[PDB]
Amino acid sequence: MADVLVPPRKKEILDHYEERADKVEKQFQRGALNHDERNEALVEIWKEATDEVGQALREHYPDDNPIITIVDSGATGNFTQTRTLAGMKGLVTNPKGEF
Amino acid sequence: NSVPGAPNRVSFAKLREPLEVPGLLDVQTDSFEWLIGSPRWRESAAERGDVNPVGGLEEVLYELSPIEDFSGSMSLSFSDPRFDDVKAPVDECKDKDMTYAAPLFVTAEFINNNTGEIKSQTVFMGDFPMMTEKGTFIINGTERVVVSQLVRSPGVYFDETIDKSTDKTLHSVKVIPSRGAWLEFDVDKRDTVGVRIDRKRRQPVTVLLKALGWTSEQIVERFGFSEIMRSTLEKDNTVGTDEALLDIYRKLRPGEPPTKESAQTLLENLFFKEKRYDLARVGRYKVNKKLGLHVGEPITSSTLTEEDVVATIEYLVRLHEGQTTMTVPGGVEVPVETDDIDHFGNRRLRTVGELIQNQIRVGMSRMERVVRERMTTQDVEAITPQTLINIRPVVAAIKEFFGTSQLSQFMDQNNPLSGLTHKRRLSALGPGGLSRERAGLEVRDVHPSHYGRMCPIETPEGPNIGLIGSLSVYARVNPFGFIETPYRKVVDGVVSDEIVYLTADEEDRHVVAQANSPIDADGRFVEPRVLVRRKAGEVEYVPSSEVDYMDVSPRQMVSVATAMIPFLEHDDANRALMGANMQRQAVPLVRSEAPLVGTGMELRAAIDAGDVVVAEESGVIEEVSADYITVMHDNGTRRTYRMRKFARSNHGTCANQCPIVDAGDRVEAGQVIADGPCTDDGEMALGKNLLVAIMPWEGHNYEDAIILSNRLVEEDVLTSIHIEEHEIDARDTKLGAEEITRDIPNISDEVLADLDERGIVRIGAEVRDGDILVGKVTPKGETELTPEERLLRAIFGEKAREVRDTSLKVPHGESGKVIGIRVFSREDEDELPAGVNELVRVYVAQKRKISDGDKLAGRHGNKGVIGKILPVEDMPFLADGTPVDIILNTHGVPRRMNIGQILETHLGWCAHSGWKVDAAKGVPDWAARLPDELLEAQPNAIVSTPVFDGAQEAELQGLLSCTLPNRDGDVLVDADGKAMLFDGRSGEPFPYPVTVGYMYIMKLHHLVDDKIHARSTGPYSMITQQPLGGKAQFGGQRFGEMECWAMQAYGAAYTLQELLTIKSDDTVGRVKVYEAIVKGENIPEPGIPESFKVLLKELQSLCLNVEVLSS
């Protein structure tokens, strides 16, 4: 677990996207948009957050980190599993299929 | 904690759970004693639900009470169910294969109307099976458990769909009751409302409404706001109660003369005459709540009320109207919604009590039929309930339930946990439920109502995912059968300690907080924005004023077995699911070491699983021996608890119980007094704490394979005792009697040596594949002897002794000692099945050690076979010279998302070496929130992390950097958690530090000796002449269709011809092949199989001339 490094800049990223999620929820609460559109906006905002957290995680790690060494070797595992081990899990699906 | 002799296991719980874990076997015991009517359930009702007693059996008798003839001259009312004492104690029943039962006595009463009498008796109804103390039925001599089933609750289901041809919401209702009939009020493509009654060609409302006593004027009177109902009134196309009900009888009963009185009576008969319609107590309460018809009215009148019919129609039409709430006259208003067939407000738990009640009813109705038929045939002034009651049907029903049923399964007991988890099991695939093919894929998903009522993790990973689950830790089943759940009531922003139980409906009504929330030591929340759950599974940040309920504790969502996984919250759900499904498959080892790192559920899962003797009342031990403990209960009395040393389980594993107390110790009531198979000091212990390193070593730990030291084999660390049972019956035969005798026709004295005199082996003889466990000789009569055989017999001076040999022989690969021999015989009056003069069972047993191919797994889903047991010197050892014991692989960790094992590893090492929080300069922030007496710990000191309030990663880092040295000045594992291993084989140090620690791993019940199999020539099937199937026989492996495709694709024609002609079916070809192999000749050319000749004779048997003409 000393070898699974978290990104220092995660909390700032999460606050930056939490402000946008809060604003979208407010514009829904004031009736400016219906129930589905705010869900779509939140989905896109949190996809952007996932991309940014993954990018910061990727640029943070060294090259001799064994987890990223295993991945970039092509031995096994894509980068998303590293993103979920450290950083953010992201959007998780509905039983029906939605986010 | 709160258990007298509790292993002092320090917890990392930051939170403080108020409510204790309940009586983990209450879902079984309370249901059964509800069925009986025990004083325990009587007092429980006195506390909660004191309205009236419903003694299961009692309800059945009352509802049946009385059996009245058609002429209405004679009545019978069996009443007042009563139970005698169990015919035999448990162990005697389990040994002598008796079903552990007790008689039923019932006061029957026969009354003649015309003359006037009562004929009261006490009729023996039948030997009713009884639950043991552990929540199991000993039926037929085995230990069977009845698994609770989940089925759709009777009630009103208002549901709607969309129509892509019209794009309109189409609402509808169904009222599927118990023992009743189906009814549908629908709104069709047009703006009319179909009222299909009993599955046949719809109806407009008005027909029924007038037939229900509601005139068109009254229809407007109540449904005036209902513009849809008003439009349907315009569309009525018919008016008049008499004409409407007459057309009802004419249509619903097609072609039946629609006479008014038969039709009027039929309306009642189907819907209000309760002999053909009974929505039960559960459905009645459900519908009462839905329509809010009644509140304090006792739950009774389990039959439909037309008052409810018109309310259903009004609610439906207002649902189409888009209303929010609805007030019915005479009842408090209710809100207007639809219903789902997953939300646990609509799926109920038909617990063992209710299932046995239903089966007893299926028996009692048959009894009633027979009773009344005979009563009519019998002459009056001569008969009595003794002459009326036939008790065959009830016995037959109960027998066919406990035996031969889907929902009465052998208690899988490999380890105590597998016992306690085969109970508490929810199974949706039962009679009255759904099959694994009619299983809607919407029934297997975790609907957000499962939180706190059914564990989302633990389900079998086979083709049963979601159809079988397990109850939560804190779940409790409502009398009606809805899975209640405890919550904490928060009022005025004040969290209290008054635990209140809620079903799924009130879970939807109200709003639920989280237990890991900042309570400010006064019930007061801290931050206003609080995590909370809304009705539809939504998650929202409510201000901290509208919260009215909070969770009782974390790890409430989770089952029993999954709550025993440390660091669960880090593992992915797939591998946690696997970990939970393999934590029930460990085998009882001979040493049974407690886990170094665990949760709080290792003690409460043993003292409640029944596989640990418990001191009933306080006392002082006097005689502690390997078989009996004598406790001197203070006030005079003494009691001898008796062990079950080396008792065979239901899957061949040991069931030893050794004491843990000494002759002078004082015990308190509720204390662990003797460990079971998997236990050590009372804490569930399924495996051993093995030293583990996480390097990939030489490709032996490649792709989930695991290597081991030879220390594990030698010092008997991993070693499971398996006790197998063999059984031979001396059945009678027409030719004579089969005699279990030492002498056997050709058997020489050399092999005979083991058999003592009766024919059985002697306790202790090391049998091996082919030994004569029991020597039985069967009459054969005179048969012709081949000239050659006669010559040899005479030359060597051996006669015939026609009586043929069929002695029992230990199956292939089933060696071991003979623990014990049990002989049942007719002379001893033992009640063997007819035809069996003697049935002898021999219990062989072997001390299986760990072996290449055995399956080992941790608590995190990280299974794997043993690739190689290396010697102790070619094992990476530390700087201290201590060799590692297993070596897992690295590549399996990151891509399976189960780093729990890593944290468990690090903490494990911390718990072994012991830490000492460097608080000389004050407690570091790393331990600022850590409880007291964790600032220092001793080597091999036991620790626990509860599931969802465990060790925060920072805590592990600091602990790992604060371990005390072993014996010299040597901190072997640095702050990172890794150590400098020396290669035991080559010698050079590994150039990079490697993770080491102590991980708790188990030995699964997938041993190689149960799996390896081989056949050259063995038994053959009967109709077709293929080799047989399964390891019980020899059999071969199915060379199925896909393998035939594979070898067609290679172009291997000759091998395909081989495997499909002269290895499976070519009857005359197999013996020629064997003869040619032995004589050393070319394998003969194969012939036509025996599946292209049975076909030919069938086609010449269905009169289709199938012929072969080369030209």
From Swiss-Prot, chain A:
Q: Which gene encodes it?
A: rpoC
Q: Coiled-coil ranges per the record?
A: none
Full protein stretch here? 733 to 831 of 1316
What does this protein do, in the record's words? DNA-dependent RNA polymerase catalyzes the transcription of DNA into RNA using the four ribonucleoside triphosphates as substrates.
Q: How does it assemble?
A: The RNAP catalytic core consists of 2 alpha, 1 beta, 1 beta' and 1 omega subunit. When a sigma factor is associated with the core the holoenzyme is formed, which can initiate transcription.
Report the superkingdom from the record.
Bacteria
Organism classification, top ranks? Bacteria, Bacillati, Actinomycetota, Actinomycetes, Mycobacteriales
Q: Which organism is it from?
A: Mycobacterium bovis (strain ATCC BAA-935 / AF2122/97)
**UniProt name for this protein:** DNA-directed RNA polymerase subunit beta'
Instruction: Write out the similarity annotation.
Output: Belongs to the RNA polymerase beta' chain family.
From Swiss-Prot, chain B:
Q: What is its EC number?
A: 2.7.7.6
Concerning InterPro entries, the annotation shows: DNA-dir_RNA_pol_bsu_ext_1_sf, DNA-dir_RNA_pol_bsu_external_1, DNA-dir_RNA_pol_su2, DNA-dir_RNAP_su2_dom, DNA-dir_RNAP_su2_hyb_sf, RNA_pol_bsu_bac, RNA_pol_bsu_CS, RNA_pol_bsu_protrusion
Pfam families (UniProt xref): RNA_pol_Rpb2_1, RNA_pol_Rpb2_2, RNA_pol_Rpb2_3, RNA_pol_Rpb2_45, RNA_pol_Rpb2_6, RNA_pol_Rpb2_7
- CDD domains associated with the record: RNA_pol_B_RPB2
Q: Sorted alphabetically, which keywords does the UniProt record give?
A: DNA-directed RNA polymerase, Nucleotidyltransferase, Transcription, Transferase
Query: Briefly, what is this protein's role?
Result: DNA-dependent RNA polymerase catalyzes the transcription of DNA into RNA using the four ribonucleoside triphosphates as substrates.
Hey, which family's this protein in?
Belongs to the RNA polymerase beta chain family.
Q: How does it assemble?
A: The RNAP catalytic core consists of 2 alpha, 1 beta, 1 beta' and 1 omega subunit. When a sigma factor is associated with the core the holoenzyme is formed, which can initiate transcription.
What protein name applies here? DNA-directed RNA polymerase subunit beta
